[PDB]
Amino acid sequence: GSSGSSGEEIRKIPMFSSYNPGEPNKVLYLKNLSPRVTERDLVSLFARFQEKKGPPIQFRMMTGRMRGQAFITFPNKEIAWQALHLVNGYKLYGKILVIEFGKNKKQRSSGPSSG
């Protein structure tokens, strides 16, 4: 009975990579936050960016039937992403924070602009 058996949970996945962020956007979607977590935490988490070049960073906390989620709006997608990959999986209050990217919704198909 020599070594050999390996991967009880993993069905030999080509890449046992955790969740995927996808495309980098300006709006981020943070989840896995303990009922204790508050805006303050978010601020400090992405505070270094606040001062960084670019308009003040906006933070939003969700408190619906199911708490443990929040959204942060950065000056642009570039900055937003950077912060994500940086704070990707930040253990807080014994919780694995999961940062994601928003999406494009409620858009208009008009444009009076001229050239």
φ, ψ at 47 (rounded to 5°)? -80, -45
Beta strand segments in 1-115, E: 27-31, 58-62, 69-73, 98-101
| 90: its two tokens | 């930040």
Sort strands 58-62 and 98-101 into parallel, antiparallel or unpaired. Answer: unpaired
Contact by Cβ (8 Å): 35, 68: yes
What experimental approach yielded this model? NMR
Distance (Å, whole) CA 106 – CA 115 = 26
